[PDB]
Design a binder for this molecule. Structure first.
Ligand SMILES: CCOP(O)(=S)OCC
Ligand SMILES: [Co+2]
Ligand SMILES: [Fe+2]
Length: 329
């Protein structure tokens, strides 16, 4: 008791986060896009309503908190997050950091300037809203670009100053987490402050246990993503991949069976609107996974339970691990 985490509706006790999905999005977009072209989503009101229905569904399934890891360049709209969080009665933790679509005004910045930006969003507030980020999101897609090196270092520095954790996008098949880990450790950041995300996009357990053994959190965060059935659709295939959700979920069991139950974070990487990809992609996603952010508690957790993962273990993964990760440390 007494540890707090910042949400888009203000501070909450860590012990009230409960069942937490640690990598999710209300809307995957671009900076300024929802303001300039809300009709792309039908309307802003249509997007918010869709998001409220989805989160209420997740809530009815036992989800109490999501971490929306949309950054500035994923077009994070913190007023939107606050509105849908209030309406659905689900906590939303917002993010600072940068993903892999930074505009030139970010790409021209130094490590010091990036550090100052991430600190502003954590310590002062995002935009003019007063809402504080509770996580820092970074990305590589292969070997880090020079700019991405700075971002990761700035993320380490902001995390060391504030205690707020860092979470990452990787190309998991290219094993990005190893260089990400090397950069974070070069800055003196503790591996227990760090989640290496999209780690279920690979079945390479040498790579995953290597990270887990060093104390990283392994983000198994794209549970419902499968394009099995959709080989007609090139963009759906590139996005979803060709592994079943059961294959992804088996990784959670695999890590638990190797002693790594406390190093695991589970999520969907779901969204309710998606403008940074092909048009109508949200109809394809909703057909593949009509349960949205309820998919983990409805499908994945019982799957694990039926494979013989004990309930206390499942609770530790979906409640205790996110609480520990999010508590500023
Ligand atoms: C399938 C979604 O991929 P990302 O987590 S990199 O986010 C796009 C908003
Ligand atoms: Co990502
Ligand atoms: Fe994501």
């Amino acid at each position: 008791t007494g540890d707090l985490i910042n949400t888009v509706r203000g501070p909450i006790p860590v012990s009230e986060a409960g069942f937490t999905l640690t990598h999710e999005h209300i809307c995957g977009s671009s900076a300024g896009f929802l303001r300039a072209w809300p009709e792309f989503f039908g309307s802003r009101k249509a997007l918010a309503e869709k998001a409220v229905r989805g989160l209420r569904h997740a809530r009815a399934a036992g989800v109490q908190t999501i971490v929306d890891v949309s950054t500035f360049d994923i077009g994070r709209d913190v007023r939107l997050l606050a509105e849908v969080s209030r309406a659905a009665d689900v906590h939303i933790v917002a993010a600072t950091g940068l993903w892999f679509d930074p505009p030139l005004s970010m790409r021209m910045r130094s490590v010091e300037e990036l550090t100052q930006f991430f600190l502003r969003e954590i310590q002062h507030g995002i935009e003019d809203t007063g809402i504080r980020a509770g996580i820092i999101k970074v990305a590589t897609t292969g070997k880090a670009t020079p700019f991405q090196e700075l971002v990761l270092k700035a993320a380490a520095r902001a995390s060391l100053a504030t205690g707020v954790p860092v979470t990452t996008h990787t190309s998991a098949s290219q094993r990005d987490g190893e260089q990400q880990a090397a950069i974070f450790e070069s800055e003196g950041l503790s591996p227990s402050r760090v989640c290496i995300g999209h780690s279920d996009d690979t079945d390479d357990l040498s790579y995953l246990t290597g990270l887990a053994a060093r104390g990283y959190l392994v983000g198994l965060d794209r549970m419902p993503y499968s394009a099995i059935g959709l080989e007609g659709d090139a963009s759906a295939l590139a996005l979803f991949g060709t592994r079943s959700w059961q294959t992804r979920a088996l990784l959670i069991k695999a890590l638990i069976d190797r002693g790594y139950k406390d190093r695991i974070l589970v999520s969907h990487d779901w969204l309710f609107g998606f403008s940074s990809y092909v048009t109508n992609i949200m109809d394809v996603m909703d057909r593949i996974n009509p349960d949205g952010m309820a998919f983990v508690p409805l499908r994945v957790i019982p799957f694990l339970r039926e494979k013989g993962v004990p309930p206390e273990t499942l609770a530790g993964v979906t409640v205790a691990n996110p609480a520990r990760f999010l508590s500023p440390t």
